[model samples]
Target: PPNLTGYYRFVSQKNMEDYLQALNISLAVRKIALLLKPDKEIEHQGNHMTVRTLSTFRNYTVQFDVGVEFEEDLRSVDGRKCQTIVTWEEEHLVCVQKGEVPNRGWRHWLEGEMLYLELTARDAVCEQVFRKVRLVP
Candidate 1:
């Protein structure tokens, strides 16, 4: 099995209607939806992993095991409560977040030196691209 372990930089652009509807964001925020730039870092060790989401508004960190369930505190960049779960789908990792918003989750996979992520909420589905810097060190 190929382990996706390393530092990754992420760039994510949200789909206005879909993302806003899914997250139930305010109309004012939705108007600037195209201005969102989100980044992330993923570190994997055996079956355990840690993920960090970084953006101009907020930063968050999550750690979990592939098959285990754990409680997570979801915080927005500006600091809001969000509950989330991370699980495995075959070789791909998936995360589902529950909050005041609607359908929200993310998927992670690897190909060659590139890592791919799909973020979904409401009617919006965002794709993120990342490059794996190195294997486990």
Candidate 2:
């Protein structure tokens, strides 16, 4: 099973601005994006899942199925449309977004009490480590 469900809070983000810039987001938006530490909630319903990123600045929700590739519009976050696929590498949840930029993808893995999230864009890779907060009701 894909054991990615949890309430997670951002601990820190590495190279977030470069990750945003790689998506062609404006500098102003990127600046704010870096400051805002978003809370993430993941819900796994068997093969399907929903991930929500909530922050004071912005919020985003993506619902997709594992092992299925679909067109994804990133909306206000990155404002990019791409074909995204999500799969599992054993217990690790991996995602790939094929878009205008190269090396774009994210992966989620659990390490003890902490949840690890790594975002890749072009030559820049952003690591956002999160702590497992609670089991969402």
Candidate 3:
């Protein structure tokens, strides 16, 4: 995978609501999330990585090491916890979440200054894009 340690500004999303619904996220929370543009702050060092989803309403932070499985509590996003593992697939960071939801996972990849995120659950998939920006911290 390419060097993903940088700041990314939220750009756009598609079918995000469907993805959230698949996770059983509440309507109230979904509405708020849909209206907000969240930024991603990512830090990487060797196999260890940290990704922070920054939003005005709520924030989600994930820390993991590549190729290792760990417990991930996603209560801030969808009120569920899952066993997750992230791996490098060519230039993509692919994450698989093992939980009650079937076929749950996400993919992150880069194209020049553009970053793309694909979130999946059951049969629903949400596509979100971000643009790389100058580091703020």
Which candidate number maximizes lDDT?
3
Q: What's the TM-score of each model vs. the native?
A: 0.71, 0.93, 0.95
Error of 3 at 79 (Å): 2.0
lDDT of 1 by residue, 86-135 (tens): 77777777888766556777888887767788878766787778775555
Better of 1 and 3 by TM-score: 3
**Per-residue C-alpha lDDT of model 2 across residues 65-107, encoded as one tens digit per residue:** 9999999888666778889999998878999999887899999
* Model 1 ranges with Cα > 4 A deviation: 11-17, 27-36, 77-83, 98-102, 134-137
Q: What clash count goes with each model? A: 3, 0, 0
Q: What TM-score does prediction 3 earn?
A: 0.95
lDDT of 3 by residue, 1-137 (tens): 57799889999999999998998888987888789999998999988999999988878899999999999998766778999999999999999999999999999999999999999999999999999997567
Candidate 1 overall Cα lDDT vs. reference? 0.68
Worst 10 residues of 1 by lDDT: 73-82
Q: Candidates' lDDT values, in order? A: 0.68, 0.86, 0.92
Q: Give lDDT for model 3.
A: 0.92
- Prediction 1 TM-score vs. true: 0.71
